[PDB]
Design a protein around this ligand. Sequence first.
Ligand SMILES: CCCCSC[C@H]1CN(Cc2c[nH]c3c(N)ncnc23)C[C@@H]1O
Ligand SMILES: CCCCSC[C@H]1CN(Cc2c[nH]c3c(N)ncnc23)C[C@@H]1O
Lengths: 229, 230
Amino acid sequence: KIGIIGAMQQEVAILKDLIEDVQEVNQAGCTFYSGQIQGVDVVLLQSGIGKVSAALGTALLISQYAPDVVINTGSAGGFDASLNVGDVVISSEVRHHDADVTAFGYEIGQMAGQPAAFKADEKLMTVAEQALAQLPNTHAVRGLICTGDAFVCTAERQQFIRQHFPSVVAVEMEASAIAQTCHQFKVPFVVVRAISDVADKESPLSFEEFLPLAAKSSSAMVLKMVELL
Amino acid sequence: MKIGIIGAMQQEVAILKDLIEDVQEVNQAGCTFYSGQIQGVDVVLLQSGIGKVSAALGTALLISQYAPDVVINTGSAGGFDASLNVGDVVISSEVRHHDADVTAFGYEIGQMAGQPAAFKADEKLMTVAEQALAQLPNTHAVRGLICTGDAFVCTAERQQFIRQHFPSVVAVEMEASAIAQTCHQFKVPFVVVRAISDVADKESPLSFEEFLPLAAKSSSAMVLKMVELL
Ligand SMILES: CCCCSC[C@H]1CN(Cc2c[nH]c3c(N)ncnc23)C[C@@H]1O
Ligand SMILES: CCCCSC[C@H]1CN(Cc2c[nH]c3c(N)ncnc23)C[C@@H]1O
């Protein structure tokens, strides 16, 4: 069973209308779509936006459907210099960019009672790298993904994040909530999203224009990965 | 009739835990659920763990699996209102994310996309708290806005940021908005009833360390009465 999570309707629509014998179960503002994608047991969660919605949705997902693995799909704000819109970002690890409990010796981005970072599953990162070889013309970057309850689009916020997380390749608003929840459940996860913007003055309109591409690019990556297990 | 009670830390849940009769304990997802009774009232006490993600996850589990009728958030807090000293009680009229920012998309500061700007506490629960306070002379209380973020607040800069965007903040902590938002999504009534352990400045780490026991005692007495009245 493959657990698949996206925040927005737009991020989950391409996978939703590809599963067969769909059983739509919407509860607590989440929608769960369960069935089969070419013979593989899936469950697509539409979580809604942000860290709290994602955690709540992921908690309901794992406790009631017990997937074997979790894949986080959708858009992202690019930080890596090589990323253009449509490009894929794969998580090596996930951090809260907006967690700060340093007053008690925790390193920046580390939440009390948690690891500094949540590490993507080694198999799943391997499986995403194989899926990438199936899409010859898509460029991809593997690295740190940072999440916060903010849409990043100002010089000053971008600068804050680059400072504390030099290695960030990309930014979004649900991944660390998904990862932390998976960590606490001991479920393997990977994040595989695509770039809609580069987190600056222009990202609102770039996101506007390029979310469809981002969801196409991301959903193609996930469609592959599904088969590869 | 069933009361959900949520604290983040062991220290914050210990007092109420020792009062549950015929306790049954579950250890799921790094959460722990204490179900049973306190003076005849069916309750379920959750120790969520710290921060917004833990709080949300725990609350989702709590509601989906135990269907409580109301939720009460208990524990410590950082005081922002000037009339507040350590051990004083804070009761939410509403809860907001002080660290949410989607203003790029037409939302007001602290409002998450797809969410209300603020999560309003249940009127009946506010009332019950007010009556519970009427029992505890010599505890000063303040009803008002509670702000949540994934940060312990202890610099003048954070404090300024927060007062500038949420002028009416009475208090600050790290779980309430996560609980309030998941309650909203589940359509379950909530109230935050916490007590002050610090004043969110340079001194708050040691202050917190020193007065977390007091705030737990202060907050726990409030919730005990409320259980009684419910
Ligand atoms: C009016 C609708 C509100 C849109 S809020 C942004 C969406 C898109 N998701 C990823 C995402 C792309 N670009 C980003 C950026 N610059 N910062 C942070 N996250 C992102 C996260 C969140 O689910
Ligand atoms: C020792 C482990 C790490 C402790 S992190 C602080 C705890 C206490 N809770 C309430 C809390 C009191 N004072 C506060 C302040 N100044 N800022 C924000 N939250 C608070 C929130 C969080 O669960």
